[PDB]
C-alpha cells in the first residue's frame, strides 16, 4: 500500500516577523522534497537522489505552492489566536497533514487531511472528502467557513486525482530505491541490570519500510511488559528498532523474539544463546 | 506534488 504524504508546520514568532514555515514530502517512509522558510530566497529543493533530474518548471511550481501555503498559514495563525482569545506575544503551532494511498490494484484507495493547533486535533477532512469534523467548538467557525468556500472540493480533487497521478510518477522515478524491500538483520543481546534480573533486547537493523512488529514470548507461556523503542532512522534510508523484556537471570533461553516484516517471506523467531 | 490551495481556517 504506497502513499504520497506532506507534513506542514507553521510556528508564529511574534515581533520577529512572519512565522517559521517547514514543508516536507514523503513517498512511503522516504522523504523526497522540503521547503524551509528560513532563507532570503527560500525554495522547494530535492531531498532524495532520484528527484534531482526534475526541471525548473517543477521547482518553480512547488516553490510557489509552498510559499502560498506559508502565507495562508500566517493568516490561519492570526485567526486561531482570535478564536481562543490568546496573547499576540505568545508563539503558537499550526500543523497540516495530507496524503493519498494506493490499494493492491495500484489505484486510489483513500485520501486524508487534518489540521492541528498547538499539537491537538483541530479540523479533520471526513472519509467522504466533502465534509469536515471540528473536534473543538472553535474549529466549528472554520468548518462553516470551509463549507461556505467549498474547500473540501479542491482538496478532494488533489487527493483523488493530482496526488494519485504524481505518486505513480515518483514510484517510477528511482523505483530502484522506493520498491526495494530490505529485510531486518535480527539478533538478541543480553544485559544484566541487577543480581536477579537481566534485559533481553531484540534488535531489527537496516530494514525498510519502517513498518515492523517485534514481540517477546515465553515457552509454555509470566512474560513482563515489553519496552518498545520508537522506530528510528539509520540515516541511509533504512530503519532500526529494538524490543526489550526484563527477565529473571538464568531463564533467558525460555524467551523467543518474533519479527514480522514485509521483506521476510515468513515471520522470524530468535532465541538468546550463550 | 503539493496542493495549489491551502484551506483558510
Amino acid at each position, epitope marked *: 500500500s504506497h502513499s504520497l504524504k506532506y507534513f506542514h508546520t507553521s510556528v508564529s514568532r511574534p515581533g520577529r516577523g512572519e512565522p517559521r514555515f517547514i514543508s516536507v514530502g514523503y513517498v512511503d517512509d522516504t522523504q523526497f522534497v522540503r521547503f524551509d522558510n528560513d532563507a532570503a530566497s527560500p525554495r522547494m529543493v530535492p531531498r532524495a537522489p532520484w528527484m534531482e533530474q526534475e526541471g525548473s518548471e517543477y521547482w518553480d511550481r512547488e516553490t510557489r505552492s509552498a510559499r*502560498d501555503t506559508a502565507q*495562508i498559514f500566517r493568516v490561519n495563525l492570526r485567526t486561531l489566536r482570535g478564536y481562543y482569545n490568546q496573547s499576540e506575544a505568545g508563539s503558537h503551532t499550526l500543523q497540516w497533514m495530507h496524503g493519498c494511498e494506493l490499494g493492491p490494484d495500484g489505484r486510489f484507495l483513500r485520501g486524508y487531511e487534518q489540521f492541528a493547533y498547538d499539537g491537538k486535533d483541530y479540523l479533520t477532512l471526513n472519509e467522504d472528502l466533502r465534509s469536515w469534523t471540528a473536534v473543538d467548538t472553535a474549529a466549528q467557525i472554520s468548518e462553516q467557513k470551509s463549507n461556505d468556500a467549498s474547500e473540501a472540493e479542491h482538496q478532494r480533487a488533489y487527493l483523488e486525482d493530482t496526488c494519485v497521478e504524481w505518486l505513480h510518477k515518483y514510484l517510477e522515478k528511482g523505483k530502484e530505491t522506493l520498491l526495494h524491500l530490505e529485510p531486518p538483520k535480527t539478533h538478541v543481546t543480553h544485559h544484566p541490570i541487577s543480581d536477579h534480573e537481566a534485559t533481553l533486547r531484540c534488535w531489527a537493523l537496516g530494514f525498510y519500510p519502517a513498518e515492523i512488529t517485534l514481540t517477546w514470548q515465553q515457552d509454555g507461556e509470566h512474560t513482563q511488559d515489553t519496552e518498545l523503542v520508537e522506530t528510528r532512522p539509520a540515516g541511509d534510508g533504512t530503519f532500526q528498532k529494538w524490543a526489550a523484556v526484563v527477565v529473571p537471570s538464568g531463564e533467558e533461553q525460555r524467551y523467543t523474539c518474533h519479527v514480522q516484516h514485509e521483506g521476510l517471506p515468513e515471520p522470524v523467531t530468535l532465541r538468546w544463546k550463550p | 506534488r503539493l496542493p495549489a*490551495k491551502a484551506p483558510l481556517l
Partner: T-cell receptor
Amino acid sequence: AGVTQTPKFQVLKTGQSMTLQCSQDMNHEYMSWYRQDPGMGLRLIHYSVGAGITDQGEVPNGYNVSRSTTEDFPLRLLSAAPSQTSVYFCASSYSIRGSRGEQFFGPGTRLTVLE
Amino acid sequence: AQEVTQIPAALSVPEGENLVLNCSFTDSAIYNLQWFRQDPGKGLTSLLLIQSSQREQTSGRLNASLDKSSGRSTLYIAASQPGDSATYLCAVTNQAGTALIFGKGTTLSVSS
C-alpha cells in the same frame, strides 16, 4: 465608503519616484493593484491578504507596496519608466473564496511617463 | 497557470437583440467567478458573482451561468439597450485563491 485613489492623473519624468495612493473603510482583509493597457486588459501587479502581508502579481517588476494598516495599501514607483504608462486600479474584497466575494474597484489613476 | 479568455473580444449588435458574452478559464479549480462592467474613463462595478457551488445568477436582463467541468461562464443579455454599451470584464480566483485574475474584456456596442 468604498475604495479611494489619488491622484486621478499624473505626469512623471523618467527616473522620478511617485506613490499611487489607495484606501478603503470597509475593513477588507484583501486588497490588490492592477494596470489596464488598451491591449491585454487587467494584469495583477501586487496583492495583500491582510495587514503586514504582501506578494508579487503577474507584472510585479518596477513597483513596491506596503500594508501597514487594513485601511491603506499604497503603490510606490521607485524609478518611473515609459513602459509604466497605463491606468492603475486599486481593488478590495471582504473575501476572495467565500460568498461575500464582491470586489470593489477605485476610480483609477491615469499615469504617463515621459523622458 | 490560470488563463482567462473572453469571446468575442468586440461585439456590435442592434438594440432589442439577445446576445451572449463568454468566459473560458484553463483551471476549473476556482472558488468564485465574477462579471464586471467598465464605463469609459471610470473603474469596474461588479455585475454578478457565481460561487463554485452555484450554477447561475440572474440580475434583470443579465443571467450568468457557470460550467466548472467545461471551464466556461456565459453571460446572457436579453433585449439589448444602448445603455448596455460598455466593456464587460470576467475574473476568476487564482490558483492559490488569494486574488482575482481578469480576462482582457469584451467591448460591447449596442447601436441605437
